[model samples]
Target: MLSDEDFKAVFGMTRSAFANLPLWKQQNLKKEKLLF
Candidate 1:
C-alpha cells in the first residue's frame, strides 16, 4: 500500500480534465489494492 493514509487527500484530483474517470481506470484503481 502507499503507507500514507493521506495519500489520496494530499495527492488526489490534482489534474483531471474530466468529471468521471474512464471505466477501466475507475474499476482498476478502485481495486483490492493487491494488484500492485
Candidate 2:
C-alpha cells in the first residue's frame, strides 16, 4: 500500500527526519553546485 505515510516508511524516513537529515544522507544531501 502506497499511502503517504507508507511512502515515507518505504524509504525509511519521515518529513521531519528528512528535514533534519544532514543526506545522500546526514551530510551528503542534494545541493546545487557551480562550475566556473
Candidate 3:
C-alpha cells in the first residue's frame, strides 16, 4: 500500500486531474491495473 504523499509524488497529479485524464490515456498509463 502507498501513502497519500507517495502516490501524489509519483504521479504528480491531483484527484481531479486523475479523474479528468482521457480514458485512452489512462488505459495507456496502466497505473490502476493489478499486478498479481
Better of 2 and 3 by lDDT: 3
Whole-model lDDT values for every prediction: 0.47, 0.49, 0.64
Candidate 1 least-lDDT 10 residues: 10-19
By TM-score, rank the candidates, best first. 3, 2, 1
| Full-model lDDT, candidate 1 | 0.47
The TM-scores of all predictions, comma-separated, are 0.27, 0.30, 0.33
Best of the two (1, 3) by lDDT = 3
lDDT (Cα, tens digit) per residue for candidate 3, span 1-24 = 788767666556785678677767
User: In candidate 1, how many Å is residue 14 off?
Assistant: 2.1
TM-score of 3: 0.33
Each model's RMSD to truth, in Å? Answer: 6.2, 8.6, 4.3
Model 1 pairs in collision: none
Better of 1 and 2 by lDDT: 2
lDDT by residue (1-36, candidate 1, tens digit) is 455555454336532432256656655554635244
Off by over 4 Å in 3: 20-27, 31-36
How would you encode candidate 2's per-residue C-alpha lDDT over 1-36 as one tens digit per residue?
Answer: 358766555455576667665444533322222121
